[PDB]
Symmetry: C6
Subunit: 63 residues, 6 copies
Amino acid sequence: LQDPFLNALRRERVPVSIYLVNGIKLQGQIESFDQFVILLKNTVSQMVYKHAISTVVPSRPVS
Amino acid sequence: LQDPFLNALRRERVPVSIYLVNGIKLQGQIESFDQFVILLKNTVSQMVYKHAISTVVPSRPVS
Amino acid sequence: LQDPFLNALRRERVPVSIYLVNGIKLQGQIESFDQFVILLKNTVSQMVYKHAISTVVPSRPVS
Amino acid sequence: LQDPFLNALRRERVPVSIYLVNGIKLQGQIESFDQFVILLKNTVSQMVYKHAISTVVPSRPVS
Amino acid sequence: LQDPFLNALRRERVPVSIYLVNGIKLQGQIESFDQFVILLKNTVSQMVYKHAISTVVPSRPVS
Amino acid sequence: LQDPFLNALRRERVPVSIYLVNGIKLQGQIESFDQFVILLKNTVSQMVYKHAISTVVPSRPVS
């Protein structure tokens, strides 16, 4: 489920919110990902560990 | 235990609360799931990592 | 150790407190369990992920 | 390292503090343990998941 | 994705922020890393466990 | 990276701070370690689970 969901966000360059396990919300666009991290682009590319992610939320409906 | 419990919620489209490991409560309907994530539908589909889930709670009894 | 401890609680239908890793306390009776989840019955059955459990505490001595 | 450290506490029945990953302190005596849980005896036996333990601290020096 | 991202930061000795799963921000330069830890240099070398990292953020764009 | 870093601290008996995933700071000297725990000596030996450690920080430069 992960790969198609993440690929749709990446491909359509949709703004997303990534909530971390502490409740902090990161925003930006999904640049790339593997089974361990997601690169999230805003002003810089920041590397997010999936193990610290609770939920990924598109800013608008994404098929 | 997971798959039958989650499938019943999905199949009956019952509103559920998903509590995360930080105490945040997400609400909506179970769209689909695998061994790593749950897609939770409200206004958008958001992807929840199971490793960040503490408990899934049906809004009403579900056989 | 887990299986006998949990089975005794289930079999004797003793009220228990399940503390989560965030400090939240859930209460009810152990309905069933596997190596990943515990079903905890109060008004509904809710599915608790063991990875988010810190401690399970019987309301009274349980052999 | 775990097994000898925990066995010494168990064998000598020394009061210990078990701090959880949320900062909550549990107290009592080590009843038994495996690679997944520790049974901690105070008034009841409560089952503590090792994955939710940060540190185990003897109330006094223990060889 | 991890190794090239981390190597670029290390090689260019760029100041970074490492956010932990509790929200605490550590700052300094990436000295070295393996699949388990990152050594982060400020006044001393401190060893950060990757399992406690949520995100690594460069202070400026880094190719 | 872990073993040489931890061994240097142990061998030189340097005071260290061990920060846990909840932000609590433990202090003392590294007595011993394996892939699962670190024994941290202050007045008593306390056993710290590595999975609950975010960072280990020497009180002074340590080669």
